[PDB]
Design a protein around this ligand. Structure first.
Ligand SMILES: [Cl-]
Length: 141
């Protein structure tokens, strides 16, 4: 119902905020090297398990894709342990950021494209629990 859906959405908003804190480091890496950072340390951000909050367990950087993982003990059943991603694409004076269900990038260096995450049993936050500003499909432009 509406109380539950609100609770979940509010919790997911914290994951987005924590993931957004990594954007500047990820972009800087890309501009410095002409390719995305493979991992958190290369990007100059904290190890993933240190990027945490009340409702957020971790934030991982993998080939420039920033993926947040919800906690399990104090979040809504439907989002426990589930994930969302942020990723960027060059516009050729700046980058544009995207946010939605989890994605991956196979290589650090191709139109900056990403693909929908393929891990079997996928733990993707349901669309209804994503903010209106975080519903991009993997193929969005
Ligand atoms: Cl937990």
């Amino acid at each position: 119902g509406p109380m539950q859906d609100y609770t979940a959405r509010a919790q997911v908003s914290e994951a987005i905020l924590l993931a957004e804190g990594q954007k500047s480091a990820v972009t800087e890496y890309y501009l410095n090297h002409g390719e995305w950072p493979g991992n958190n340390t290369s990007a100059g951000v904290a190890t993933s398990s240190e990027i945490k909050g009340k409702y957020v367990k971790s934030v991982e950087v993998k080939n420039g894709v920033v993926t947040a993982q919800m906690a399990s003990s104090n979040v809504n059943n439907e989002i426990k342990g589930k994930k969302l991603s942020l990723w960027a694409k060059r516009q050729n004076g700046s980058v544009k950021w995207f946010c939605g269900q989890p994605v991956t990038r196979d290589k650090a260096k191709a139109n900056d494209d990403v693909t929908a995450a393929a891990a079997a049993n996928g733990k993707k936050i349901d669309t209804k629990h994503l903010p209106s500003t975080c519903r991009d499909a993997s193929d969005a432009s």
